[PDB]
Design a protein around this nucleic acid. Structure first.
Length: 50
DNA sequence: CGTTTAAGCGGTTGCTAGAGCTGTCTACGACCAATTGAGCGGCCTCGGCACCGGGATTCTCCAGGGCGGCCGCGAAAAGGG
């Protein structure tokens, strides 16, 4: 956990665990921007998720 | 293969169902004798189907009566010597 690297998809290539990064990206990015862009969002939900 | 989730194990807390044991008794079924009426075989008779004799009903055939055609036949009109 000290050799954690800030990487990019073109900087990785084809290694094991790439679909872990894919699942992370799709899940966090899609419902993060969904809860940021929805009109039916209360302040309580955004503060508990923050 | 990544992720979630529910199985598995251990734990609570009280009550109730159920197995096991002991005890009592009472209705219920085995058992026996006398009896008799429901089952099995035969015997008799009717309902219905069928066979036979008799009578009524409709179809086919043979003969008589009348009419057409032939068979030369025979009386009669016209021509010839």
């Amino acid at each position: 956990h000290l050799h954690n690297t800030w990487e990019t998809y073109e900087s990785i290539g084809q290694v094991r665990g790439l679909k872990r990064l894919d699942n992370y990206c799709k899940q966090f990015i899609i419902e993060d921007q969904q809860v940021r862009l929805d009109p039916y969002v209360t302040a309580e939900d955004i503060e508990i998720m923050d």
